[PDB]
Structure formats: structure tokens, C-alpha cells
């Protein structure tokens, strides 16, 4: 069983770049034929064992009976790549190429959402950086609740698709969008802070369940498979009376330490906001007594995560436009020294006459948050010194949302 | 694009066992359609994040236009498994099953090769063990140079296939044989002791190169892909004058610490044996001055490996049937206190009137080897105490080769 | 500032064994002078970096103005040991010795408490083992609630000291007892199952707090410092009305997954037993509705711990001497599929006409417990197969408590 | 045996800062009494187990019979610290304090040596940084061959002490100098690139041996013990004829991958430079055929190190003031594709009319070096893109040596 005759790779034994199109030729290709890569690399000098990866499905761009076009992937080191035709069980070697390094930079960079031009813009990167500054966001202009999973070199967020809110990943390497959910279930919110996963609260049926929607990214066949369907084995829960899905998802939810309780905020019809807690075992409940002009959940990562119990302090940024608490207050959500109930603590930071519009975390730091104010200002708060520190390069900032990412 | 209509899984929402056949039905299946699994598991109590795996190709056993039979895999924990039809790009969910635990036992067990019945036999396991004792070896009755890669729950070795020696993996879960090399190149020897890989010296063309032949096992799509083609980026080397491939491979080669030099032994036409060293950068050379009646390379693992620099002492067991050194001597190969050259050290252990016929390592111990003698006896040597300790259960042992494995 | 003159080590440049006495001589020693070790080792062949340890305080056995006797420690590899005189700030090298390997065997072994002879006995070890079988327990004949912290090569438990129950470590290497608590506070119980620590509930003042009492063992100056004082920063709690300290501590408590809730059992005056839960944030509460003839908490470790979130299923073994539930029932404690409250589940294993008197865990296995019955029988239950498997070597067993240890 | 009466800590139960003096009082203190700390911390919310450390020797600043002054250490998180009096065996608790966070920032920062003012200056740190900019270098104004061990928050280098070159650590937290060698042996050079250790070539006796001189820093009692004495168990080697110690140490040596061969450069009397290799098993040898106007060894770290086999490409920067190779050439030292001998490769980067005066590595990047030129310019070379990238903030730079550090 020879799969194809007079076959090969046009670019055989040449050096090719991540993102390039490689061409395969031959007689006898069939509908459903797939293409696999095997990678071999040496990071420094060659030693046994080397670095190995395979089989990794190749993205097929064009397809005919006389050949096919495939795309070379990013995110591998410089590699000897062997290209195989895969017909069900069988594999046949077509040829080899040398693939130039496609590893993504690991330094954290700040990105802003430009709603005027509908673009993601790189707002800050540390010195000796100038790759490519802007990404077109016009395929999903409503991109919302934007967050980063460390090392993915792209952004996760919510956007309208088939009449509901769904999670997408924007890949910085290609500028392409990848759906993260298998089914078309409406998504209340993304949830960050677990440690090394992005979760989402989605409508599994009559009610809402907690899903892992980043598992397709943290996995070696990402290129050909990104949609996940991983709900928790817990019951579904309805929203409390009065509340509707459109009231959620403007800001990411946050896992409390232990990852059992999730902090959300909901926007009421009259423009006021309430804190809302979610327990995947018990459901939704409103944290009573607070109705403010803006509420954003946050967390401080008190140690570096490992890609295990991720240690953190979480809370709500609470903003009032007027009165005795005019401005933005940052208050931790912690259990009472008396007993079980979760109570909002007195503020550890308060900024009168300033409105917080975005919060995000640089994960190569510990115990800090990065905040975007308007009167625009970008500033870090360090938990251990209890002091703010402004970014002096970043006063223009024509953005309502910014996000740290690598 | 709905792939198939009136489709599903016969065993949908039921509990199935690893090794079972699951049936898929529907109208519109096509040649080349594949099937993918996504796994979700909770080892203890459920917490976010859970355990996830996917896509993992399913082995397809039977195939028609109205449906297909697939085999459920071993080596995953108890999992919710979602089954997808994969037609090139597209995926469609067919159904879900609960897959019972398929994790393999991690305790080290001793296995012997029975050349009379052509079977692998479990010779020793520690208390409270009685699973399944024997495996049929008749598909490859010449199975040779048998070794284990820790945690694979099976045995690697050499056997004749298409007129040459090639590496195979015998899977203990199924009793099935998997080819480890993609091409049909003759294999001089398997090489163990790197830390977490099995290598092989194979004829890449005019000469011999060093390959990694276990990479297909240490990889999540093992079930549908096991053959590797991973030579080192080093030149090919011919054997020294006089020597031929049939003289090698009776015993596994051993990596010295640093994994640059490999110890081999070769059998001459007259029944004598010589030590032979191999450097993947420089080629083959005979360690001069020794011609004995049996030579087996060995290593001591002086720390537990991590699945990084694996620390060890290596050498040759040298056996003479008569004379002043009658019996089996164990001598380390180390560099001279004077300069570079590798010299055989004086023995650290010597057994007169006993012939060593197999050596193997239990990797949950440190600094020991396990040895099989004939006058049969099985005994451990502990480097730190310099003492032998016999296994009292294991005097019968109708085997010439035994191997520790998990 | 030369500390001492005409000084040295009697055994300078010689090979010495762990446990040996080494002698130091010189003029000018002072009260309070200490002795430090620096260790250098090569596990396999020498490479940079080597293995290093230092300063490690030496145990001083005898002391005079003309010299001192020190004990060489166990638990290091074969090492070049440099011996330093330490006078406050200053250090002076006295000499060097070669210390033979003192690493303790890592294979799990079963030990029984012999109350007749007041001895710890090795009841089981796997083949090729015969070191030293018995340890004298007469210094603490009431040694109770015996458990192992993996890799410590000794046993932790409770014994009477200064009129109260306190934690001790019996070191297998020396047969010597080490106190684990700094203060003389009464100990209700040891608590196991956290992952890599032994906790204890102790009377910090008016009430009880949770302590870590193994931290002194998991620390490189263990030889000279073992007593810890590490309470949690949580309030103290009294026992519920009626209960008294003498009712606790016969069996180790067990951490539920997440390490927030602890399972205990308490013996009433009339010989009946009740389950008692402890929350370090909220205090003690009786798990109502159960009054049995014996109750022992247990856990299954569902993955190997790392020395992170340790995954497990925990519960109570509940024994009744008569009636519809005659015998020993094993029931998990889990939260209801309905809501928050912790409920005892229906049994996953039940043994009529057999009384469980000890439960313990072999941590190189996953998902098993080891149980000791009387009609004596020793048997493993495997969570994944739901089957018992008896140890056929272990029917005599003149013990009420057995413990797995390495 | 009560050690001291009417004793306590002046600052008992108060919050104190790293670097502060804490006072201990009482009657009956003795010469040689030491003081130990035990630390307990919770990074996020409290959970069992917490973070623990102890015993950690306290630095004693003042000492009398009625009390003592101790310094509170840096580099721990915010901790409950219990303070113990240590008299030989015995310990007594004196009191407790709350120690504010002393963790050092982990972001890499660039530091320059100012030979005019004799100061270490912080030349670059990324945004939102302004701690303390300058450190006084006047205690060792000849500080030379300056390097960083990651996470130490200070600088290692060579300086004159007792008539010879010796390694010192300058601690950024305190500005204090710590000796790294126990004995007063002349040091040819520091050697970097092993992965997580700083080595040094030092005169052990008649000849030179390889030492680990950073082990005292990577160790929890660093505060009271920094001097190491850890030579390799290899013979001593003399320098080749003609060469003298004053010709070495201007630049750090570099370990080749595998850490067996070390690259050095030596300055001749006439101002010319030669490459010199060192093998700890075989000794020194000149890499013949090269005599240049400046030579600096370097390495590229091709992966992040783990604090295992550190992968890297190493070589020599070779500078000529005139001729066909005017300027600075960067050439790897690799083994020939033909055989064993180490040959200088053709340059991978060449800068005509620019002189390299310092090279250093930012270890949160991979595959880069940072270089300081004069015509001053600071620039990164990225191995994977083969492109330079200048730091635009750093043109003034009144330094001959700069170093990346955290
Ligand atoms: Cl056994
Ligand atoms: Cl009572
Ligand atoms: Cl910057
Ligand atoms: Cl000269």
C-alpha cells in the first residue's frame, strides 16, 4: 500500500519560515487525507536525547487530487521537520524541511483595545522591542473581557457568534481568530486567576455550568484543534430572579484562592452595578448591601504560578461617582474573623476623583495589579509597599481596556 | 456541513472498559474518516481545573459506510470520554461514555523469556499481586535484547522483520506488538541508560547512526502512532574491519554518564567476545586487550531519574570459563587518574565458578543491579554495601534473560 | 583570632561510618562552642556542580576544654566532610573525613507495635531485605497513633511527657527519640494526609490550635533541632461540652482534600465512639447520628505526593459488633450532591464479622489502603478495582497497630 | 536548665523591618551564645501547610552579659518570627516579632561600574522602578570580573584581600561585602555559565583547582555563613610555561555545555591577548594561533535554567584594532564536524570599527547577549534572528563593565 506516487515536497531540504506555505505534490491523493509533522531539535549543542515532537497535524490550506498546500506552524524551536501523508491508519514520508525558530517572546507586554480603529494595539514593551504593533479586530469588533493565558502569545475574550457570547483566542503570530468552545452556548463571563487555565460560565442547558475553555490552547495539536467541551461534573444553576445574561461579561470573573468561589460583577438596567458571587457547587448569590457606579473584580498573585495551589488575595474595585466615597476603592473579599461568611474588607487603597476602567496583572511580578484611570493614567499598586507607581510613558492611552500578555 | 445523519454511539452514556470495542453508527461515513477522543477526569474530589486530554486518535478496528468499531484505550484514569467523528478539518460529536480506570500498575516486576514455550513470563512481583502471568511471544519468537522504559508497562527489544533486526514494543495491556522504527533499517543494538529514552544504533545508509526509538511511546497519541524516525544530526560510521552486524545486539548497549559514549559487546565467529565502544561524534572503536567468553555491559543508576543529568557508574561484566580469572568479573569503565583514555578498572565484584547470563535494573532502587547466574540464581549487588543478596523465591528460573519492568 | 591551638581531628583523612564517634582535640575550647559540617559528594562520576551541603550542626556527645566528641550523621551520601569549630561568628577548620553512605532505604516497609515486648517490629519488607528487625520502645511504652512521614525513615506518634500527650519521632537509624514540639502542650491528635507534613491539634492556651510538628524533620539541621512551634494564625477553640482530651488521639486524624476540614474520632466513657470534625477556622463539631463500637478515619491518596494540591478521598471506617451493620464499614465523607453539608456516604466496602483495628497507607501505591482485621489478617483495598487482596505472609501479626513507612 | 532570666525582646510583638536592629535583654548571657530565628508565613490566604523556615542563625551586632543586638534579615516574606537563644544544644524562646516583607525584586536590572566615583550604579531598570541607585565600592575599589548569580540580588567579583585575588559578594540590600572563599587562595578567575552556580579557579596548593564559591549564597544560613571550601576531587594543575596569575581574571571564564571545558582569556605583557582553555581533569592549554587586542569569553543560554543539563552555545569575542578583521568578532567554540578537536568557528557576528568592552546576559531572555561598545553603545544580539538591537536610553554609559542582575 503505497499511498501516492511521484510524490514529494516542493520545498524539500530547504529552510522555511513559520507561517510559510509548503507545497506537497503527487498522484493519488484522496478526500480526508491528512498531513502530520514530526519535529527534531537541538536547543544548544546536540546531545542525546534531543527534543522531539510528533505527530502534530498540519493545517491544510489548499487541497487537490495532484497535491496540497500546508502551513508551517509557529511556537516550535528551529527544527528538522519530517512531513507525512496520513491516510487513516497509514503514514508515508513525503520529505523534510528545516523550519526556522518560531518561539514566541516571553516578556510581558501591555496591549490596549482601540475602539475607534477596531484594533488591538501594543501600548508598552520594554526596551529593544519593535516587532509588529497593531492587530485588526474587525472580524470581532465587539471583542470584550480581554485576558491573557500566560505563554499563549495571544488574547482570549468574548464576542458575538451565532447570536450568543462565545470565547475566542486571537493569535498574535497570525492575527487569526480561534473559537474556544465546541458548542454555541451563551457565555456569561470568562474567569481568570485559577493559575494556568481560563474558565468560562456557559449555558450548558436550562442553567449555567463552569467550563475550561483554554485546554485546546495548552495542547500540542492546537493548530488543528482549539474548541473544547469541558464542563465540571456539577449541577447547572439559574441566575437569581431579575438578572439576565446581557448584564454580565464586561469584566472577567476572578477565582478566589482554592478556586471554589468566583467573583463577578453585574450591570443593572439603570447603570448601577452589584457584586455577584458564584459557587460551582451551590450556584449564584448577590453580595448584598452594595450598589455602585462601577465594580471590577481583581486578584493579586502572591507567588509565581507553575505551568498545585495558587496563592492570592482577591477582591472588588468599587467606584462611586459622588458622595462620601467618591472615586475608586479597592477592597479584599475575605472570610470574617468571626465565622464563615465572606465580607468585603475596608479599602487598602482609595483614589478620590479617579475612575478605574481596567485592571490587569503582569505575572512576572508578584503582588501587583496594573490599573487604568481616567480623570488617562496607568499605574501599578504593590501590595507589600502599599504604594502606587505611575507609568510615565503611558499618559495618552486612548483605551478603555488594557491587558498584560505574553 | 453535518458529517453524518442518524448517528450515535451504541454504548452512549454507559460505562465501558479499556480494551472494549465501542460501536459507532450513522449514514454518510467516508474513507479516511477518523475518530477522536476527549478525556475529562477527577482523580480525587472534583476541583477546577480538572484533568483534560484531547484530541487523542481512536484506534479503528472495523469500518463500513453505516458505522465503525473503535477500541477504548488503556493508560488513562477513569474518564468522561467524548467521541468525535473527524473528517479532515471538521469534527462532530457522536456521544459520550464513561471509561473505567486504565492506569497501569507502577510497581517494578521481574519478567523472564521462556524460549521453550515462546512466552514472556512474570517471574516476580511483590505481595498482593496476581493479574495475568504470561504473554505469547510467537509473533516474534526471536525477541532479543529485552529492556523496559519505565512506566510504559511493556517491553522493548529486537526482532527480525523484513529481513533485518528492528525494535518492537510488546504492550502488556493488550499483548500486541508495535513497531518502533519508521524505516526498515537494520539495528545493531538497543541502548539503555540515557535516563528516560531507549536509543538504537541503526543503518541510516552506508553507515550507522544513533536513533531515539522510544519517542513514539512517550507521547499521547501512542495508540495510533509508534514508529519514530529520529536520528542524531551526526555523521554515519562504518563498523571496524572484520566486524559484521550479526555480531551485535545480544545485549543492550549502555550510555556512560553524559550520554556521549556507549558500551557494546560483540560476539566473534569463534564464540569469543570483545568490548566495543561507540561515540556518536567519532564512531566505533574496540577496547583493546580483552577477549573473553562473555561480555555484558551494565550501569548503576546512582539516583532516581526524572521523566537533566542522569548520574551513574557503568562498566562491563567479563566472564572467562577457565584459568586465573575463572568466572564473572564486574569492572567499571572510567577515565584514568592520569589522563583522558578510558580504562577498565579492577573488579569491584568477582564470582568464581558462576556465569552471568542476564543483567537488569530495578529503578525504584538506587545503586543496584540484578543478575542472573547459572552453575540458576537471581541476586542483587548493592554498590554502597558491596554485598550480594539472593532472591530466595527465584531458584527455578528457566530463563536466559530476565528484565525488570513497570 | 585563632580559636584553638594544636587542634585537629583524631580520625582525620580516614573513612568513618554514620553513627560513629569522631574526636576533636586542641587547647582553648569554650562553653558554647559548636561544630559544623560541610559535605561534598559525587553520586556518579564527578561533574561540576557537585552535591553540597553546609553548614550542618554536628551533634556533640562529650565536651571538655581539651576537646570534644561528635557523632557522624546518617542520611547523606558518601561525602567528603569538612569539620569546623564554630565560636559565635568565627569558624576554624579542624580537619576532614570521608563519611560512608548513610542514605536510608526508600522502599516502603510495614512495622507493627508489639505491646507485649514494648517494641517496634518490622513485619514486612520485600525481597532481599534483612537489616535490623526490632526497635526498643521502652522509653515511651505508651507510643500511640503511630504514623510515618515519607522519606524520614522513622515513626511519629504520641506519648506521655511532663504529664501531657506530645509528639515524638523515633529514628530508625539510631533508635533514638526526638521531641517534635517546643512547648509542653497537650496533644489531642496527630493529623496526616496533608501531602508532605504531619500536623497536630494542641492546646496553645485556653483552647486548641492546629500545628505543624514535622517541619523540624524536613529540614537540613534536623540532627541538632527537631522541636517546632508553628501554630496556624487562627483562633483557639474549646472542645464541645462533655468532651475531654483523654477521649482523643488513639487514631490519627485525616485532612480532607483542600486541608481545611479534619476528621477525628472520640471514645466515650461507655466504650462507644463518635465521629468529630475539626475546622481550624470554626472549631469542633460532632458529626451527629453515629455512635459506634469503633471509628477510624482514613484517606486514599489518588496520586503520588510531591515533596501543591494533594488529591484524595477521605472517610470513616465504622464498626458495629452486632445488628444489621455488623462488622466494619468504610464510608467516604463527601458534600451532598444537593448542597454544602458534609454527609457520610453509603459504604464502598463492608466486612461482616471482621473488626478493623488499624489502617495505614503505602504511598508508592495509589488509591489503596492497608487494613488489619481480627476474627489476624492484613489486606489492601484498591479503590479502582473495589477489591481486597490479602497479604499471605502476614497471618500471625501479634499487633493492634501497623504502619507503612520509609 | 533555664538559660537566662528576666529575658525578652525589646520589640516583642511589634512590626519590624528587614535591616532593623532588634534588642534582646536578660541576665546570664554567655560568650558563644547564638540566636536563631524560626519563620512562619502565609503568602496569600492562610492554608495548611504554611511556609516555614528555621533555624536560621541571626547576625549578632552587639553583645554583652545583659543582652544583645541582632539584625533582622532580608529575603523572607512577611513572617511571624520567633527568636530563640541558642546555647550549644539548648534553645529558649525569647519572643516574637512580625517581620515586614524582605523579598528582593526579581526583574533583571543593568548595573555599571563607575571607576571615577568607585561606585556600582543602576544603569537600567524597566518602568515603575526607583528604589536606590548607587552603591559605594570603596572597600574594594579594584572590584573586577563582576557577575550575578540569579536571584541573589547582589554581585560577585574578584578583589584584592590579604595579598591575593579572592571572590566577594556585594549584597544590594545592605551594601555589605561577604567573602566567598574560606581560605586565602589566589583566584585566577570566576567562571559562569554552569546553570546555577559560580565557580572559581583557585590555587589549592602547588597548582590550581576548580571550586564552587557560590554555595554559601544558595543556602538558608547565608546571613551567618558565606565562605565555602568546595574544590573538585581532581588533581591540581600548573599554568603553562610563561604564564602568571596577574594575566587572568579581567573577564569571567565560561563553562562550555556539559561543564567540562572552561574558556578563559589571558593578557600578555605586551598588551596582546590569547584564548586559554581549562579542563578540570587535564589542566590548561592555549588555543593556538590567536593573538588579539582583546578577548572576552561568552555564552548564550538557549533555555531558561532551573534552580540538570544547561543548554548553550559558547565562544570568544575577538577584537583587533586594525587589519582585515578590524573590530569585534563573535566566534563560537565548537568541535569540528570532522573529529574531536575544538576549533573556533567563523564569526556569527562582526562589528568593524567598534570595540566590545563588556558582555553580560539577561537570563529572563533566551538566546541573547548584551554588549557594551565604544567608538558608548549598549546592544543585544539575538541568536535566533541574528540581529542587534540597541538600547536607546543607554548612550551615555560612563562604564567599562556592565552586568545584568537580579
Ligand atoms: Cl515480596
Ligand atoms: Cl462520656
Ligand atoms: Cl522600559
Ligand atoms: Cl608575557
Q: How far apart are CA B16 and CA B96, in angstroms?
A: 11
Chain D: give the shortest CA distance to residue C35, in Å.
Answer: 9
Contact of B366 with B304, CB cutoff 8 Å = yes
Burial class of residue C270 (count of CB atoms within 10 Å of its CB; 0-12, 13-18, 19+): exposed
Contact of A179 with A161, CB cutoff 8 Å = yes
DSSP character for B256?
Answer: P
**Residue whose C-alpha is closest to residue D311's, from B231, A42, A101:** A42
For strands C79-87 and C5-9, give the pairing. unpaired
Task: List, as one string, the DSSP characters of C301-323.
Answer: E-S--------EEEEEEEEESSS
Q: How far apart are CA D93 and CA D84, in angstroms?
A: 4
Q: Which three cell numbers stand for residue A200?
A: 468560562
D380/A303 touch (CB, cutoff 8 Å), yes or no: no
Burial class of residue C298 (count of CB atoms within 10 Å of its CB; 0-12, 13-18, 19+): buried
Cα dihedral sign, B357-B361-B365-B368: positive
Q: Give the SS3 label for residue B214.
A: coil
Mutation choice for A interface testing from D17, D44, D383 by most A CBs within 10 A: D44
Contact of C193 with C180, CB cutoff 8 Å = no
Q: Which residues sit opposite A284 in a β-bridge?
A: A278
Chain D: give the shortest CA distance to residue A171, in Å.
Answer: 21
The set of long-range contacts for B341-347, using a CB threshold of 8 Å and a minimum separation of 24, is: B342/B261, B342/B277, B342/B287, B344/B275, B344/B287, B344/B290, B344/B315, B344/B316, B344/B318, B345/B315
With contact defined as 3+ CB pairs under 8 Å, the chains touching D are A, B, C
Contact of A136 with A119, CB cutoff 8 Å = yes
How far CA B356 is from CA of A174, B287, B329, D182, in Å, comes to: 60, 21, 9, 49
Q: Work out the widest C-alpha separation in chain D, in whole angstroms.
A: 81
Contact of D331 with D343, CB cutoff 8 Å = no
Q: Which three cell numbers stand for residue A188?
A: 456569561
D340/B309 touch (CB, cutoff 8 Å), yes or no: no
Residues of D in contact with C91 (CB under 8 A): 182, 225, 227
**Residue whose C-alpha is closest to residue D236's, from D201, D195, D194, D196:** D201
**Residue whose C-alpha is closest to residue C303's, from C372, C257, C252:** C257
Backbone φ and ψ of C245, nearest 5°: -55, -35
Contact of A213 with A228, CB cutoff 8 Å = yes
Structure-solving method: X-ray
* Chain position carrying cell 447520628: C289
Tell me the HSE value of D85 on the side-chain side, using a 13 A CA sphere: 29
Secondary structure of D165-214 as H, E, C letters: EEEEEEECCCCCEEECECCCCCEEEEEECCCCCCEEEEECCCCEEEEECC
Burial class of residue A57 (count of CB atoms within 10 Å of its CB; 0-12, 13-18, 19+): buried
Q: Which three cell numbers stand for residue D98?
A: 512580625
Contact of B326 with B310, CB cutoff 8 Å = no
End-to-end CA distance of chain C: 46
- Model resolution, angstroms: 2.5
Backbone φ and ψ of D204, nearest 5°: -70, -25
Contact of C296 with C350, CB cutoff 8 Å = no
Neighbours of B351 (CB within 10 A): 21
**Residue whose C-alpha is closest to residue D227's, from D242, D218, D214:** D214
With contact defined as 3+ CB pairs under 8 Å, the chains touching C are A, B, D
Distance D111 CA to ligand 3 centre (A): 15
Q: How far apart are CA D391 and CA D370, in angstroms?
A: 10
Tell me the HSE value of A65 on the side-chain side, using a 13 A CA sphere: 1
C380 touches chain B (CB under 8 A): yes
Q: Give the SS3 label for residue B222.
A: helix
How far CA A26 is from CA of A4, A66, A92, D231, in Å, comes to: 6, 5, 12, 63
Residue B324 Cα to chain centre, angstroms? 37
Which of A50, A89, A196 faces B232 most closely, judged by CB atoms? A50
Residue A314 Cα to chain centre, angstroms? 19
For strands C154-161 and C164-171, give the pairing. antiparallel
Backbone φ and ψ of B246, nearest 5°: -65, -15
For strands C342-344 and C327-335, give the pairing. antiparallel
Tell me the HSE value of B317 on the side-chain side, using a 13 A CA sphere: 28
C17 touches chain B (CB under 8 A): no
Q: How far apart are CA C223 and CA D205, in angstroms?
A: 34
Neighbours of C238 (CB within 10 A): 12
Q: Residue B337 region, left (φ>0) first, then alpha (ψ -120 to 50), else beta?
A: alpha
Q: Which three cell numbers stand for residue C284?
A: 469542633
Q: Which three cell numbers stand for residue D73?
A: 534579615
Q: What is the CATH number of domain D1-103?
A: 2.60.40.3920
Contact of A62 with A69, CB cutoff 8 Å = yes
Secondary structure of chain D as H, E, C letters: CCCCEEEEECCCCCEECCCCEEEEEEECCCCCCEEEEEEEECCCCCCCCCEEEEEEECEEEEECCCEEEEECCCCCCCEEEEEEEEECCEEEEEEEEEECCCCCCCCCEEEEEECCCCEEEEEECCCCCCCCCEEECCCCCCCEEEECCCCCCEEEEEEEECCEEEEEEEECCCCCEEECECCCCCEEEEEECCCCCCEEEEECCCCEEEEECCCCCCCCCHHHCCCECEECCCCCECCCCCCCHHHCCCCCEEECCCCCEEEEEEECCCCCEEEEEEECCCEEEECCCCCECEEEEEEEECCCCCCCCCCEEEEEEEEECCCCCEEEEEEEEEECCCCCCEEECCCCEEECCCEEEEEECCCCCCCEEEEEEECCEEEEEECCCCEEEECCCCCCCCCCCEEEEC
| In chain B, domain spans | 1-103, 104-406
Q: How far apart are CA B215 and CA A53, in angstroms?
A: 8
With contact defined as 3+ CB pairs under 8 Å, the chains touching B are A, C, D
Q: How far apart are CA B43 and CA A274, in angstroms?
A: 36
The residues, ordered by sequence, that sit 6+ positions from A305 with a Cβ below 8 Å of its Cβ are A150, A195, A196, A363
How far CA C152 is from CA of A77, C198, C216, D119, in Å, comes to: 42, 12, 11, 49
Neighbours of A324 (CB within 10 A): 5
Chain A: give the shortest CA distance to residue B88, in Å.
Answer: 5
The 10 Å CB-count burial string (b at 16+, else e) for D374-406 is eebbbbbbbbbeeeeeebeebeebebebbbbbb
Backbone φ and ψ of B223, nearest 5°: -55, -35
End-to-end CA distance of chain D: 46
Burial class of residue C360 (count of CB atoms within 10 Å of its CB; 0-12, 13-18, 19+): buried
Q: How far apart are CA D372 and CA B340, in angstroms?
A: 39
Residues of D in contact with A128 (CB under 8 A): 380, 389-391
Touching D: C residues 29-48, CB under 8 Å: 30-34, 36, 38, 40, 42, 46-48
D270 touches chain A (CB under 8 A): no
The residues, ordered by sequence, that sit 6+ positions from D153 with a Cβ below 8 Å of its Cβ are D75, D104, D105, D171, D172, D173, D405, D406
Q: Which residues sit opposite A114 in a β-bridge?
A: A119
Sheet holding C67-71, edge to edge: C5-9, C21-27, C67-71, C59-63
D106/A391 touch (CB, cutoff 8 Å), yes or no: no
Q: How far apart are CA C51 and CA C35, in angstroms?
A: 21
**Residue whose C-alpha is closest to residue A212's, from B80, B97, C309, B52:** B52
Contact of B210 with B232, CB cutoff 8 Å = yes
Taking CA D376 as the corner, what is the angle to CA D372 and CA D382, rounded to the nearest 5 degrees? 35
Q: Give the SS3 label for residue B223.
A: helix
Residue A266 Cα to chain centre, angstroms? 21
Q: Which residues sit opposite C320 in a β-bridge?
A: C326, C327
Tell me the HSE value of C201 on the side-chain side, using a 13 A CA sphere: 29
DSSP character for A237?
Answer: B
Sheet holding A368-374, edge to edge: A355-360, A368-374, A377-382, A387-390
**Residue whose C-alpha is closest to residue C210's, from C229, C184, C196, C182:** C229
Q: Which residues sit opposite B336 in a β-bridge?
A: none
Residues of A in contact with D334 (CB under 8 A): 45
Contact of D381 with D368, CB cutoff 8 Å = yes
Mutation choice for D interface testing from A42, A45, A406 by most D CBs within 10 A: A45
Neighbours of C375 (CB within 10 A): 7
Q: Which three cell numbers stand for residue A42?
A: 537541538
Q: How far apart are CA A356 and CA A317, in angstroms?
A: 8
Question: Is the bond leading into C348 cis (omega within 30 degrees of zero)?
Answer: no
A71 touches chain B (CB under 8 A): no
**Residue whose C-alpha is closest to residue B248's, from B323, B199, B191:** B191
Residues of D in contact with A43 (CB under 8 A): 302-303, 311
Contact of A177 with A170, CB cutoff 8 Å = yes
Q: How far apart are CA B325 and CA B347, in angstroms?
A: 11
Distance B125 CA to ligand 1 centre (A): 7
The residues, ordered by sequence, that sit 6+ positions from C203 with a Cβ below 8 Å of its Cβ are C164, C185, C186, C187, C188, C209, C245
Taking CA A153 as the corner, what is the angle to CA A149 and CA A154, rounded to the nearest 5 degrees? 75
Note the ligand closest to the C-alpha atom of A394: 3
**Residue whose C-alpha is closest to residue B74's, from B155, B172, B168, B157:** B172
Q: How far apart are CA B342 and CA B338, in angstroms?
A: 11
A141 touches chain C (CB under 8 A): no
Chain D: give the shortest CA distance to residue B235, in Å.
Answer: 8
Amino acid at each position: 500500500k503505497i499511498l501516492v506516487t511521484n510524490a514529494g515536497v516542493t520545498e524539500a531540504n530547504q529552510t522555511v519560515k513559520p507561517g510559510d506555505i509548503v507545497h506537497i505534490y503527487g498522484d493519488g491523493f484522496q478526500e480526508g487525507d491528512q498531513v502530520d509533522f514530526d519535529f527534531r531539535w537541538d536547543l544548544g549543542e546536540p546531545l542525546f536525547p534531543e527534543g522531539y515532537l510528533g505527530p502534530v497535524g498540519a493545517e491544510i490550506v489548499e487541497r487537490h487530487s495532484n497535491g496540497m498546500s500546508i502551513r508551517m506552524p509557529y511556537r516550535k524551536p528551529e527544527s528538522r521537520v519530517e512531513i507525512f501523508l496520513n491516510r487513516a491508519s497509514e503514514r508515508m514520508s513525503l520529505g523534510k524541511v528545516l523550519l526556522a525558530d518560531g518561539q514566541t517572546p516571553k516578556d510581558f507586554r501591555l496591549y490596549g483595545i482601540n475602539e475607534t480603529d477596531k484594533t488591538i494595539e501594543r501600548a508598552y514593551a520594554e526596551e529593544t522591542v519593535t516587532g509588529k504593533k497593531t492587530w485588526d479586530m474587525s472580524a470581532h469588533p465587539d471583542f470584550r473581557s480581554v485576558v491573557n493565558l500566560q505563554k499563549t502569545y495571544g488574547l482570549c475574550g468574548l464576542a458575538e457568534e451565532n447570536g450568543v457570547q462565545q470565547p475566542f483566542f486571537l493569535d498574535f503570530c497570525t492575527g487569526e481568530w480561534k473559537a474556544l468552545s465546541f458548542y454555541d452556548y451563551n457565555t456569561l463571563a470568562l474567569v481568570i486567576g485559577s493559575g494556568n487555565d481560563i474558565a468560562a460560565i456557559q449555558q450548558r442547558g436550562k442553567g449555567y455550568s463552569l467550563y475550561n475553555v483554554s485546554a485546546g490552547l495548552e495542547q500540542s495539536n492546537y493548530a488543528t484543534k482549539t474548541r473544547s467541551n469541558f464542563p465540571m461534573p456539577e449541577p447547572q444553576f439559574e441566575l437569581p430572579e431579575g438578572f439576565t445574561p446581557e448584564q454580565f461579561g464586561d469584566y472577567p470573573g476572578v477565582f478566589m484562592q482554592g478556586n471554589e468561589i468566583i467573583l463577578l460583577s453585574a450591570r443593572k438596567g439603570n447603570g448601577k452595578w452589584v457584586p455577584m458571587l458564584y459557587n460551582y457547587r451551590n450556584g449564584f448569590y448577590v453580595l448584598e448591601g452594595i450598589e455602585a457606579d462601577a465594580i471590577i473584580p481583581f486578584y493579586f498573585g502572591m507567588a509565581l504560578p507553575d505551568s498545585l495551589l495558587y496563592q492570592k488575595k482577591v477582591g472588588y474595585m468599587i467606584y462611586y461617582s459622588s458622595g462620601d466615597n467618591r472615586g475608586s476603592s479597592f477592597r479584599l473579599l475575605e472570610p470574617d474573623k468571626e465565622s464563615s461568611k465572606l465580607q468585603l474588607q475596608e479599602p487598602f487603597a482609595q483614589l478620590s476623583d479617579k475612575k478605574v476602567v481596567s485592571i490587569t496583572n503582569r505575572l512576572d511580578r508578584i503582588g501587583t495589579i496594573t490599573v487604568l484611570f481616567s480623570d488617562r493614567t496607568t499605574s501599578d499598586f504593590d501590595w507589600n509597599s502599599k504604594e502606587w507607581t505611575d507609568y510615565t510613558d503611558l499618559s495618552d492611552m486612548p483605551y478603555n481596556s488594557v491587558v498584560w500578555a505574553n
